[PDB]
Swiss-Prot record:
Changing L22A: Important decrease in ability to inhibit both Nav1.2/SCN2A and Nav1.7/SCN9A. The record marks W6, R26, K27, W30, K32 as: Binds to the extracellular loop of voltage sensor domain II of sodium channels (Nav1.2/SCN2A and Nav1.7/SCN9A). The chain holds residues 54 to 87 of 89 of the full protein. Shows a weak or no inhibition on rNav1.4/SCN4A (IC(50)=3.9->10 uM) and hNav1.5/SCN5A sodium channels (IC(50)=>10-25 uM). This toxin has also been shown to weakly inhibit Kv11.1/KCNH2/ERG1, Kv1.2/KCNA2 and Kv1.3/KCNA3. Changing P11A: Important decrease in ability to inhibit both Nav1.2/SCN2A and Nav1.7/SCN9A. It is found in: Secreted. Changing R29A: Small decrease in ability to inhibit Nav1.2/SCN2A, and no change in activity on Nav1.7/SCN9A. This lethal neurotoxin (without cyclization at position 53) inhibits neuronal voltage-gated sodium channel Nav1.2/SCN2A (IC(50)=10-150 nM), rNav1.3/SCN3A (IC(50)=338 nM), Nav1.6/SCN8A (IC(50)=117 nM), and hNav1.7/SCN9A (IC(50)=9.6-33 nM). It inhibits activation of sodium channel by trapping the voltage sensor of domain II (DIIS4) in the closed configuration. The toxin neither shifts the Nav1.7/SCN9A activation curve nor modifies the slope factor. It does not slow fast-inactivation of hNav1.7/SCN9A channels. In addition, it has only a weak affinity for lipid membranes. Two forms of huwentoxin-IV exist in the venom of H.schmidti, a non-N-terminally modified (HwTx-IV) and a naturally modified peptide with pyroglutamic acid residue at position 53 (mHwTx-IV). mHwTx-IV shows no observable difference with the unmodified toxin when applied to the TTX-S sodium channel of DRG neuron (IC(50)~50 nM) or when tested on hNav1.7/SCN9A (IC(50)=30.8 nM). In addition, similarly to the unmodified toxin, mHwTx-IV has only a weak affinity for lipid membranes. Expressed by the venom gland. Belongs to the neurotoxin 10 (Hwtx-1) family. 22 (Htx-4) subfamily. This is Huwentoxin-IV. The lineage of its organism: Eukaryota, Metazoa, Ecdysozoa, Arthropoda, Chelicerata. The presence of a 'disulfide through disulfide knot' structurally defines this protein as a knottin.
Length: 35
């Protein structure tokens, strides 16, 4: 499943929403797409 944009992802386990192309930010723990 996905994770929302401002949601807490895993810095050392990038997953997030691969479907919507959001990648986890490591230093910031949120998901980011274009930002």
């Amino acid at each position: 499943g996905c994770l929302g944009i401002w949601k807490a992802c895993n810095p050392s386990n990038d997953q997030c929403c691969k479907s919507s192309k959001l990648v986890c930010s490591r230093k910031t723990r949120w998901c980011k797409w274009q930002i």
